[PDB]
Every structure is written in C-alpha cells, then in structure tokens.
Design a protein around this ligand. Structure first.
Ligand SMILES: Nc1ncnc2c1ncn2[C@@H]1O[C@H](COS(N)(=O)=O)[C@@H](O)[C@H]1O
Ligand SMILES: Nc1ncnc2c1ncn2[C@@H]1O[C@H](COS(N)(=O)=O)[C@@H](O)[C@H]1O
Ligand SMILES: Nc1ncnc2c1ncn2[C@@H]1O[C@H](COS(N)(=O)=O)[C@@H](O)[C@H]1O
Ligand SMILES: [Cl-]
Ligand SMILES: [Cl-]
Ligand SMILES: [Cl-]
Ligand SMILES: [Cl-]
Ligand SMILES: [Cl-]
Ligand SMILES: [Cl-]
Ligand SMILES: [Cl-]
Ligand SMILES: [Cl-]
Ligand SMILES: [Cl-]
Ligand SMILES: [Cl-]
Ligand SMILES: [Cl-]
Ligand SMILES: [Cl-]
Ligand SMILES: [Cl-]
Ligand SMILES: [Cl-]
Ligand SMILES: [Cl-]
Ligand SMILES: [Cl-]
Ligand SMILES: [Cl-]
Ligand SMILES: [Cl-]
Ligand SMILES: [Cl-]
Ligand SMILES: [Cl-]
Ligand SMILES: [Cl-]
Ligand SMILES: [Cl-]
Ligand SMILES: [Cl-]
Ligand SMILES: [Cl-]
Ligand code: NA
Ligand code: NA
Ligand code: NA
Ligand code: NA
Ligand SMILES: [Zn+2]
Ligand SMILES: [Zn+2]
Lengths: 429, 430
C-alpha cells in the first residue's frame, strides 16, 4: 500500500559503486545502468516566455556538472534529451500584451536561453524537442492512454487522466515521490492530458476536438518516443517533483502499462535569495545576463560547485556569496600561470633530474588527491569536497615550484590531471 | 621444471578492465591486472645519447606513448612512468674522444636532440627521468647488495660479475625467463659484468672494487628498483632488448630483492623495417626523425604508427610510399573538423526544425556502435589500427549526414567531442 522501487540488476552492467540521492527511494542508492554502460537521460527544459535567471542557472549548471562527471570521468555513455516548451498559457499571454505573436516570442526567448547556457559553458543535449514539433505524437500518446482505460474524455472535448482507475491497478501507484501532496471531471485530482481550446485560443486538431496539450503530457510523450520505456535518469528542480514529475510517471506508466518508467529521479535544490526561492513570480530574480555583467562564468560555476547539487542554497547579493568564488578563481588562475610557464621554459640540458625526496612527497600527495576526488564523485557528486581537494593540492604544488628542484614530467602529469578535473567541472583556464 | 612459471596478480581490490596485453613473460595475451588498486608502475628503457634518433626509435616511443595515453586517458588507470637516459656508454666515450668536445657535453647534446625530437612527435614526457650519470652512486650500492646475497663475484682486475650458476640454483630464481633458448676472469662465459674496471683514457667512478664504469644492464635495475621498488606493473622496450638486456635486468633485480617476479607484464614493440631489414645504425639504412620531419608532419608520422600494431613488425616503404596513405588520412581528418565546426557555427535554431528524425536516430545508433567497437579494440591489446578504421567509417557517415540531412546540432557536438577524445588518446592534434 506504499510505493516500491526496483533496483536494476547488476549483471552485464557498468558498475562504479556510484551512489546518488534518488527521489523515488528518498535515499542514496547505488546507480546501476539499465543496459550496459548506457544512460538514457531526460531533463525538463525552460518555458520560453522570458529571460532565464540565476536559479535556472543553478539547476542547469549543477546537472551539467553531473553529466560531465558521468561522461568525462566515469566514461558512461549518455544520451540526453531536453524539451523546449514553446506552447504554453504563459507564452500566449505575454505574446498578446507585447502584440508580437505566439511563435516570434517563443523563438526569441529560446534563442536567449541557449545563448545564456553557452555563456555558462553548459553543454547542449543530444536532442532538443520542441512541443510544437510533437503535437501529433502527443495526440497518439493520449489515445493509447485512453485505450488502456486510464484516461477519459469530457463533453467539452478535454481528456483527463483517471487517477482512480490508475490506482486501482496493483501494478501502479500514483504520486510515487510526493504521496502526501495529493462537474466536468470524475475527481478533483484528475488532471488534463488534452485541454479543449476556446475559439480565441491557439489550438490543434484531435480526435476529441480542437485543443492544446495539457501541462505534463508533453514530457512523457517526447521522452517515451526518443528514449522509450525506461529512463535511467530524469532530472529537474525540486519544485517540479510534484505535480509535474509525479504526473509524468503516471502518464508514462499508464501508456506502457508498467511499473517503473524512471530508475533514478534526481532533483536539484533551489537557489534562494534572502531566504525565498528565486522566482519570476516573486520579482526577486537576477538574470543570467545581469550576473555576467559583474561575474565571469568560472566564478559562477565555482559558486554552484561549492553548493551540493541536491541541497538548498542561499545566494547573498552584493557579492557576499561571490567573494569566495572570486578568491578561488584567482588562485586557480595564478596557479596555471606558474605551472604553464615553468613547463614551457624548463630546460632539461641545464637541469638535474635525480628523483629526490621532495619529488616523492609531492607525487604521493598527488596520487592521494586523485583518490580523494574519486571517493567524492562517487558520494553523490560531492563537488564541494573535490574542489577543496584540488585547492589543498595546489597549495603544495605552489610551494614545490618555488623552492624545490622541479621534476618537469611530474608537473606535466599534474597539469594534465587538473585540466581533466576542471573539464569535468566546466571550468576554463 | 626447466620452464619459467608466471604469477598473475590477484584480482581482489584491483581495477579490472578486462584489458588483454601481449606479455613476453607468458609469450601470450593475458588479462592485465594492477599489482595495487588502479596503479601502474611502468619503466621504459630510454635512448643511448651518442647520435641522432631514427624512425625505428620513433616507432617504439610513439607506440608506447599511445599505449600510455590509452591506459591513462581512456581507461583512467593511475600511471607512473620512468625512462632512463644512458649517458655513460662505450659509444658515448668513443665519440667524445673523436670529437674532443667532452663526455658530458656530448651526451647532453644528443639528449637535447632526443627530447626535441620527441616533442616534435608529441610524445609525452615520463613522470621521472633518470640519468645514469646521476645514479652511479646508487648503482654501486645496488651491486653491493647483489654481492652480499652471493649472486655476484669480484674479479682481480676490479670488475664485478653476476654469477649465473649461483642464481639458477635457487628454486625461486630462473635465468632467462623470456628467451630461455637464447642462453678468462669469469667463472662461466654466460656471466655478465655489473661493474667493469676502468679502461685507460675512459671516464671512471670510485667503487669498493676500484675505478670503473657501470656495466651494460645494471643501471636499469637500479633506477627502476629505487623509484618503483620490488614489483613493476609494466616494463617496455623494443623486442631486440628482450635478450639479453631485459632478461638480465630481471636477474639483477631478483638477486637484489631475492624474490621471484620483478615485473608482472613485459611489453616488447615490433621493429620498423626498411627494405626487409630492421632500421639500424649498423646497417646504415636509417632515416633520422629530423630528416623525416622536413617532409611529414607529426600527425602523419603518428598515423603511420597507428596503422601498425605495436607488437607486430612493420615495413616502411621509402620515397614516401608508406606515407601516401597517412597523408590522405590526415587530410580527411582536417577537412572533417573544418566542415563540422562550420556547420555547428552556422546552425540557426530558428532556421532549423529540431524534431528527432529517423536519420538522426540512425547516425546516433552508428555513433554508439563506434564507441563500443573502439572499446573492444583497445581491450584487444591496444589495437589502434582497427580503432582508427572505426573512426574513419564514422567520419564518412557524419560527412554524408551533414551534407544532406537536417542536423541535430547537439548530436554533432557529442560526436565531435568523442572524436577529439579519441584523437587526444592517439596523440593527434587538429
Ligand atoms: N530558484 C530556482 N533554483 C533552482 N532551480 C530553479 C529555480 N527556479 C526554477 N528552477 C528550475 O529551473 C528549471 C527550469 O524552470 S522552468 N520550468 O523553466 O521554470 C527547472 O528544472 C526548475 O525546477
Ligand atoms: N586520469 C587522468 N590523470 C591525468 N590526466 C588525465 C587523466 N584523464 C585525462 N587526463 C588529461 O585530461 C585531458 C583529457 O581531456 S578531456 N577528456 O576532454 O577531459 C588531457 O589533457 C589528458 O592528458
Ligand atoms: N628499427 C627499430 N624499430 C623499432 N624500435 C627500434 C628500432 N631500433 C631500435 N628500436 C628501439 O628503440 C629504443 C631505443 O633504444 S636504443 N638502445 O637507444 O636503441 C629501444 O627500445 C629499441 O628497441
Ligand atoms: Cl526496472
Ligand atoms: Cl541539463
Ligand atoms: Cl565510452
Ligand atoms: Cl524581438
Ligand atoms: Cl565561456
Ligand atoms: Cl570579476
Ligand atoms: Cl557559497
Ligand atoms: Cl631548468
Ligand atoms: Cl581547463
Ligand atoms: Cl615465479
Ligand atoms: Cl607477483
Ligand atoms: Cl615511452
Ligand atoms: Cl647543446
Ligand atoms: Cl607538436
Ligand atoms: Cl625462447
Ligand atoms: Cl612511486
Ligand atoms: Cl644493452
Ligand atoms: Cl615482434
Ligand atoms: Cl613539413
Ligand atoms: Cl606534408
Ligand atoms: Cl601535426
Ligand atoms: Cl602503412
Ligand atoms: Cl584533437
Ligand atoms: Cl577541433
Ligand atoms: Na496501487
Ligand atoms: Na512542488
Ligand atoms: Na632453477
Ligand atoms: Na636480442
Ligand atoms: Zn517536464
Ligand atoms: Zn634498459
């Protein structure tokens, strides 16, 4: 009578002993691919009606880092999909007051969104799926949900998910991740898959009449069509856990008539500003473009690296939060300057190369750091502690370069390792 | 039992990739297992610095550079690599008297040129460089311990010789583990000098046994032992060095530590031949690395080696016959990057429909197949020839997809990043 989770079998799968905080189990569990070393991942994208703000940046940069860890560090094979919500009540209302038109507006703010991602060094996904391009597939998806007796059609022409029918099934549980958050309709908790459209509203043809997709049906449709019956990872901010993500699971479970559409559901914590979530609704937001007029990409990525992806974070404006980010950015910059110049200008003809005790000591700390970072990454993508490991290492390399006789080959190897980690962080020096 | 036995490392607590390597100790492909965790301690015999390096030298150092890059960059093993510089040697001594420029100055000259040649070929420097001139004191202490364990004796002239018969008697010791069939002052003709009493007009060093110079092989056991210790994961070199140089290193180090296995995996690269014979200084058939670089680029030379399995022999056709294919491959890669970078830049999100089409699905399917083919090849004793071919086939389809199909920009980025990742593992630069 309470929801259960099935862990993937380990037979035939890439095993790293990675553990992640899974919202389906409300706990840290071992990450195991559904197939081989493959990771099918779907991530909720923006509604393109306005600029993106620092809170959006927190989620997309945090999960960009995680993706980089998964691909660049652990050498998993990741296929990532992001939707663009270019049809929405919000897009419609903003397009009338601006009088610029449904599509011109969606395309404008989609452009600015990818430009903002580009500025933060956020990698593009393998696939981008616009809702406008998938309306035909949404209708076919909805039709099968009805064919499976888990959705019904109102007289106005709307289609609603039948929660009671879905629960009835022993194979299904509704609201797996937030159980306690639960005239035309059967039950008040039923939500629309297809919304009948007024003559003055944009609409699409359907077997049930002119209408528009409902709030959650799009994400289940596109992810199912591109990634199929089992997603390894589905991600988003914690606010989307209920009702958006829980409703995605009900739709996809109802469509495929199975019990687990997602193995691992990851939720980033919110960025708060003066104790409240950064939200357009609260008019407390800092745009990404505004943030880049005072701080660089490396500095902003360091800020997110310092805050565990799954915890809440508080941003103090006026740069109180960014002081530490700027100090770390400075130490990284100067470190690379010295080690690069020393590498480039080092002359072997004049240098004595005997492997000294200081060389042995630095090397030992270097290999210890590699292990500390590996354990940190396995521990739910603990970048704050991995970043500290790099800083401690750099403190000792700095001492060695200044005083000790330098083994050039050792310094090269150290530079290569730190480049590799910084590429995993998305830092660029 | 008249045949050497090999101890495979335990698998418990160690990184297992299912990599297989051609281990000259077993004369076979065996699963590679680190001695400790994911660490690999690796020692590689370096050059003798009395002259220029040639294409055969290049083949071995580039081949093992690629292998090192695969182990580190692809499989994420933790590798410590040591290369010696043989800057004391009969040849160095003979040339420095003919030139009258002086022993260290001459060795330092050709050492400089060796490293400039490696940098031109994009060969990464090892973690540790050990000059013999810097380790002669340690060489002497090493010899002392070998004598204390009764595995070496001192001639009256002041030379010190390894005692093969004493060494073989031990049940724990077997002499010539890798070429069993290749086996006056001395007890037996098969004994070899660890320390040689000093010839007149030759440089010399003090020792408890008199003025002398290290013998041919003692340096490599000494430096590898002092920095890496009693068990090397990997020891590498050209196949000609397997016997007597590498088998004698094993006898020296086993005698020093009095144990049974100093090296877990011994890798020997194949020779580069020119007109059916090994490229050799003695045969006067060699092409210098510098000479080669006036006609061909680093990428082209590395592609030449990528196409030939590291442990096979390869025949180099001169006048650029063998380099024709390499230059074609390098040009196709250059054009590929020029094109894919332009298409990425010119992509307009307003301009393009982004629906995940069946052509997008087909290219992606091929892309993931290529990743697995390349993984299987790297596990298959570092089969770069078959991996390079996999990249070439993929690039051909990406070229077709770009010309006609409506392109998924994110897919193209992922593909370009993977190819950059594989090309970095190859030491290619585009
Ligand atoms: N203050 C905040 N802190 C962290 N993440 C935040 C956020 N606000 C939204 N998201 C997240 O940003 C993404 C895009 O939001 S959307 N659907 O376009 O409004 C979603 O994953 C939200 O949870
Ligand atoms: N385990 C390791 N230890 C040390 N250096 C390592 C490394 N893995 C990669 N590099 C290094 O990281 C870079 C690979 O680029 S990439 N894949 O896009 O991040 C190169 O500079 C490698 O030498
Ligand atoms: N024709 C050839 N093909 C491939 N490898 C060759 C080679 N000649 C020498 N080496 C190799 O190049 C390295 C240089 O060492 S030394 N003692 O200075 O010559 C050794 O590992 C030789 O086996
Ligand atoms: Cl499952
Ligand atoms: Cl993302
Ligand atoms: Cl991979
Ligand atoms: Cl506009
Ligand atoms: Cl940037
Ligand atoms: Cl600044
Ligand atoms: Cl902070
Ligand atoms: Cl120097
Ligand atoms: Cl970097
Ligand atoms: Cl044995
Ligand atoms: Cl052993
Ligand atoms: Cl090498
Ligand atoms: Cl010089
Ligand atoms: Cl170069
Ligand atoms: Cl033999
Ligand atoms: Cl060591
Ligand atoms: Cl020799
Ligand atoms: Cl061979
Ligand atoms: Cl040229
Ligand atoms: Cl050329
Ligand atoms: Cl080049
Ligand atoms: Cl060839
Ligand atoms: Cl490259
Ligand atoms: Cl490039
Ligand atoms: Na139920
Ligand atoms: Na919520
Ligand atoms: Na014996
Ligand atoms: Na030989
Ligand atoms: Zn969604
Ligand atoms: Zn050697």
């Amino acid at each position: 009578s309470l929801p259960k989770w099935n862990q993937p079998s380990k037979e035939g799968k890439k095993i790293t002993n990675l553990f992640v905080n899974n919202s389906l189990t409300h706990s840290k569990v071992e990450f195991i691919p559904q197939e081989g070393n493959k990771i099918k991942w779907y991530a909720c994208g923006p509604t393109v009606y306005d600029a993106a703000h620092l809170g959006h940046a927190r989620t997309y940069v945090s999960f960009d880092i995680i993706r980089r860890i998964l691909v660049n560090y652990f050498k998993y094979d990741v296929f990532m999909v992001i939707n663009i919500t270019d049809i929405d009540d919000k897009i419609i209302k903003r397009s009338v007051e601006e009088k610029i038109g449904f599509t011109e507006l969606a395309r404008k703010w989609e452009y600015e969104f990818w430009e903002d991602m580009k500025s933060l060094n956020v990698l593009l996904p393998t696939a981008i799926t616009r809702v406008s391009e998938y309306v035909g597939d949404i209708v076919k998806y909805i039709e099968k949900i009805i064919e499976n007796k888990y959705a019904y059609v109102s007289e106005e022409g709307s289609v609603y998910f039948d929660i009671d029918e879905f629960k009835k099934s022993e194979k299904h549980f509704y609201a797996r991740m937030e159980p306690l958050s639960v005239k035309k309709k059967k039950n008040a908790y039923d939500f629309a898959l297809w919304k009948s459209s007024k003559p003055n509203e944009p609409h699409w043809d359907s077997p049930w009449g002119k209408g528009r997709p409902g709030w959650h049906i799009e994400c289940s449709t596109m992810a199912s069509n591109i990634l199929g019956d089992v997603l390894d990872i589905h991600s988003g901010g914690i606010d989307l856990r209920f009702p958006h993500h829980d409703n995605e699971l009900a739709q996809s479970e109802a469509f495929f008539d199975h019990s687990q559409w997602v193995n691992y559901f990851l939720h980033s914590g919110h960025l708060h500003i003066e104790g409240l979530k950064m939200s357009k609704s609260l008019k407390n937001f800092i745009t990404i473009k505004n943030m880049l007029t005072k701080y660089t990409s490396n500095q902003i990525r360091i800020l997110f690296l310092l805050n565990k992806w799954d915890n809440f974070m508080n941003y103090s404006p006026n740069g109180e939060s960014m002081v530490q980010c700027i100090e770390i950015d400075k130490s990284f910059t100067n470190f690379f300057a010295i080690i690069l110049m020393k590498i480039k200008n080092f002359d072997l003809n004049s240098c004595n190369l005997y492997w000294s005790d200081a060389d042995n000591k630095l090397n030992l700390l270097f290999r210890q750091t590699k292990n500390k970072i590996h354990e940190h990454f396995l521990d739910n993508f603990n970048t704050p502690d991995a970043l500290l490991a790099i800083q401690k290492l750099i403190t000792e390399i700095n001492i060695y370069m200044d005083k000790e006789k330098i083994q050039i080959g050792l310094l090269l190897e150290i530079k290569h390792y730190i480049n590799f980690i910084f590429d995993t962080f998305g830092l660029i020096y």
